[PDB]
């Protein structure tokens, strides 16, 4: 169908936009003097880089499922999504500690929370890919059900990161400080939309696609649609409002 030419365009424009916003963030690193909201900026740079990685990875699902592209998908998908949600979790934890009235974390500490929370997913993904490509049969003799089950089960730590970020961002809603509540509100909205999208495509891939007798014709389309849509949610519900808030300061 036309999903190979629409989504690719929706990828390509995204690849443009997440660069420009990246530039629109870097210049702000020369102009923001708050010492409390500046500490999140390297983490948001890493988040923008991970969104760019997601938009680039969408081509791996647009291009035919190959013995070359399957390790690329099975490694990069969970790793980049865990990087995004770990950056969101670090920002939400900084907001939790800021709304309560405590001194904000340094940017190095927030970057350590952003990177170290995504290292477990990196270890899991590299172990799975190395074991399949070395000890296994190089994805060759796997049924569509086996591949879908492995792809879903490989994302359990990412789902745990989603739930943890949801609860931590919800914890920002109470406290004596009110000017940090809007950042946590944006994070909460983004995580809720991401959770809804993830529930939708997991239910469609595991159960919806065999129900409509469209397996495995709809697997790569629903995963690519979910990838592009959630990357656009990351761009539009979190990054752009953060840019708007940081610009008027």
């Amino acid at each position: 169908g036309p999903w190979g030419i629409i989504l690719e365009s929706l990828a390509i424009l995204g690849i443009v936009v997440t660069i420009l916003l990246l530039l629109a963030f870097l210049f702000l690193m020369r102009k923001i003097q708050d010492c409390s909201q500046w500490n999140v900026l390297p983490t948001q740079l890493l988040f923008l880089l991970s969104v760019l990685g997601l938009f680039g990875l969408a081509f791996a699902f647009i291009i035919e499922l190959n013995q070359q592209t399957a390790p690329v998908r099975y490694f990069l998908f969970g790793v980049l999504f865990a990087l995004c949600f770990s950056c969101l979790l670090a920002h939400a934890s900084n907001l939790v500690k800021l709304v309560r009235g405590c001194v904000s974390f340094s940017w190095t500490t927030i970057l350590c929370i952003a990177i170290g929370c995504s290292l477990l997913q990196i270890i899991i993904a590299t172990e799975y890919v190395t074991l399949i490509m070395t000890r296994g049969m190089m994805f060759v003799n796997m049924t569509p059900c086996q591949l879908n089950v492995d792809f879903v089960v490989l994302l359990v730590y990412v789902l745990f990161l989603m739930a943890l970020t949801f609860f931590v961002s919800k914890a920002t809603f109470c406290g004596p400080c009110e000017n940090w509540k809007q950042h946590g509100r944006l994070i909460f909205i983004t995580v809720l939309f991401s959770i809804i999208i993830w529930v939708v495509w997991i239910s469609m891939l595991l159960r919806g696609n065999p129900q409509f007798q469209r397996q495995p014709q709809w697997d790569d389309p629903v995963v690519c649609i979910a990838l592009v849509t959630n990357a656009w949610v990351f761009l539009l519900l979190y990054i752009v409002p953060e840019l708007c808030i940081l610009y008027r300061s």
Partner: antibody, heavy 118, light 108 residues
Framework: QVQLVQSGAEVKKPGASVKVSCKAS????????MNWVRQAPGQGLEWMGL????????NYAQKLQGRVTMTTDTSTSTAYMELRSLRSDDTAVYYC???????????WGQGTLVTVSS | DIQMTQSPSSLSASVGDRVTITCKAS??????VGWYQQKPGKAPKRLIY???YRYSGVPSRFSGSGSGTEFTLTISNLQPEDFATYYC?????????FGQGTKLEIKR
């Protein structure tokens, strides 16, 4: 779209070696494993081995090890199969079959007849 | 290796009849069974992969079913171009093994 074209039928002697080629077109040749399957006249299909064109890793059948050699050429995208020390029971039609993911042997060559007789 | 036995070796039927070919595996091969159709003088043609899925361009008359060590290919509405030799193949583990082949013949 996807096409696998082999060489012509060949007649050999029962002490020689045979090379069967398989030109692949219409797809990325590097990212798909190639099997070789032979069929005796009047008999069923018999699997011989595989080669991965990405790293030239081969896997042969137990009864054929020691005389079968599978190579690939990425520049021309052609898979070659060599059979040495031919016997009268090696007279068969040979097929190159491509393996894609989630599926089974979906694309086949037209078949090359090797006739081994003195 | 895994022995893959077909039943029957040859059966006769007419146009419009429904036929069933049974394939039995010595070991548990899950659902990693394909079905192929071969005409005299031509290469085998894909019919079924994963023991229940049809390739693109395969008519809906062919239907695969079964699991474990018991698999079944069913042709509902027989056609003159459907009379050929049918093979069941397993790809659960190497080496690949085929069936002996079931020849489909016109009954009169």
């Amino acid at each position: 779209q996807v096409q696998l074209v082999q060489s012509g039928a060949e007649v050999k002697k029962p002490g020689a070696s045979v090379k069967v080629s398989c030109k692949a077109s219409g797809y990325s040749f590097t990212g798909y494993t190639m099997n070789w399957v032979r069929q005796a006249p009047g008999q069923g299909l018999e699997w011989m081995g595989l080669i991965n064109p990405y790293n030239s890793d081969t896997n042969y059948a137990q009864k054929l090890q020691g005389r079968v050699t599978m190579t690939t050429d990425t520049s021309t995208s052609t898979a070659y199969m060599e059979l040495r020390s031919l016997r009268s029971d090696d007279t068969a039609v040979y097929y190159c079959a491509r393996v894609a993911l989630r599926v089974a042997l979906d694309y086949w060559g037209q078949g090359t007849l090797v006739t081994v007789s003195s | 290796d895994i022995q893959m036995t077909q039943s029957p070796s040859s059966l006769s039927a007419s146009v419009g009849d429904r036929v069933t070919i049974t394939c039995k595996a010595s070991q548990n091969v899950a659902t990693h069974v394909g079905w192929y159709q071969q005409k005299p003088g031509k290469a085998p043609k894909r019919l079924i992969y994963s023991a229940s899925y049809r390739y693109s361009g395969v008519p809906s008359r062919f239907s695969g079913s079964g699991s474990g060590t018991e698999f079944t290919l069913t042709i509902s509405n027989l056609q003159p171009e459907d009379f050929a030799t049918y093979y069941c193949q397993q790809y659960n583990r190497y080496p690949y093994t085929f069936g002996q082949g079931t020849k489909l013949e016109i009954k009169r």
